[PDB]
Write a protein that binds this ligand. Structure first.
Ligand SMILES: [Mn+2]
Ligand SMILES: [Mn+2]
Ligand SMILES: [Mn+2]
Ligand SMILES: [Mn+2]
Lengths: 163, 163
DNA sequence: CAATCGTGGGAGACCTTTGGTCTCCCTGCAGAT
DNA sequence: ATCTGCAGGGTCTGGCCAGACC
DNA sequence: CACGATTG
């Protein structure tokens, strides 16, 4: 009954579903660092691992993480950060005792009927609100689509269905 | 007394130096996976974690990892893998109780006088053989330059000097 | 703070800082000795 | 196996093609 | 997706 979902990008989130139906969602911790004399956001390694140590999810809990698949038209910094966020999350999840199952974005979108949307991030927040109504106040901003994708990944791995 | 050096690429290595002067060097564990219907080498996350947790180095031991600096002329997959390997190693080292200090490749090269070499991989192997003569049999192949790079990073953090 | 937009990008360490100069790692294939 | 050369590249799923996505 | 802006 324990399922973890991870949206790994810099505005992403981690969702935890418990066997009693309750859910948690945490924004991905980040820090500001200096790269090439400008400011960049990067995931906070220590806060991520400290977040995972304090979860009540037992070892062997499956973590469903979105498969890294950046676009060819994305720049090389987008490719680096997609890879960096992917490896940092996977290593943190494996070291915390969790079994990592990568899920393509096409898989959970087709599962919830979210393919070919004009507003995919808004539809994600709507679908996660319907699946997790106690998280509806945590999904009202446009920036909360990372929270929704983490919830939908965990909802996919748990086998929940929309009404 | 205890210093760890990490060369994070797919042919890289991790070197561990003990306060009695002895040394160990392990090739980076990897697996073959399928990406876009071809075979790719990716770092073996679970084997890296259990390698770090089998070390006798106490928690708080500083792990010097080569700083990520892919070239602008490198392709977007090289940027992805450089980022992925960097984040996978950093999260693995932090979760195992080690403190991570990134070191630019120019830093330990200048400290050992290896800059502007026409055969830099050969020179790293010869420099590591002189610093760690019980690893001379483990540095005889050209592919062993990742073992040398990890040994030299660890030698930089320990303050060793060449004769 | 929160949202929107347009394009896809290096980064780093000294030298003798206040910018300039110069340096450095790879991946992913194919083929050959 | 081990080394060399060279240019810098998507990847995925639902069934080689088609069409989808961060 | 990232990055480096601009918008109120
Ligand atoms: Mn995502
Ligand atoms: Mn996201
Ligand atoms: Mn290296
Ligand atoms: Mn290397």
């Amino acid at each position: 009954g324990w399922v973890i979902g991870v949206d790994p990008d810099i505005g992403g989130a981690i969702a935890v579903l418990s066997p009693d139906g309750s859910s948690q969602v945490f924004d991905n911790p980040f820090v500001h660092i200096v790269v090439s004399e400008v400011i960049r956001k990067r995931l906070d390694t220590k806060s991520i691992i400290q977040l995972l140590r304090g979860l009540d999810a037992p070892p062997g809990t499956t973590a469903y993480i979105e498969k890294s698949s950046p676009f060819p038209t994305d720049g090389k910094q987008g490719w680096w950060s997609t890879g960096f966020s992917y490896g940092l999350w996977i290593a943190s999840l494996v070291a915390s005792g969790f079994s990592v199952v990568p899920i393509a974005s096409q898989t959970w979108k087709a599962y919830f009927g979210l393919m070919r949307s004009e507003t995919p991030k808004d539809d994600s927040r709507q679908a996660a609100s319907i699946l997790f109504p106690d998280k509806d106040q945590s999904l009202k901003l446009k920036k909360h689509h990372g929270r929704a994708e983490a919830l939908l990944l965990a909802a996919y791995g748990k086998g929940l269905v929309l009404p």
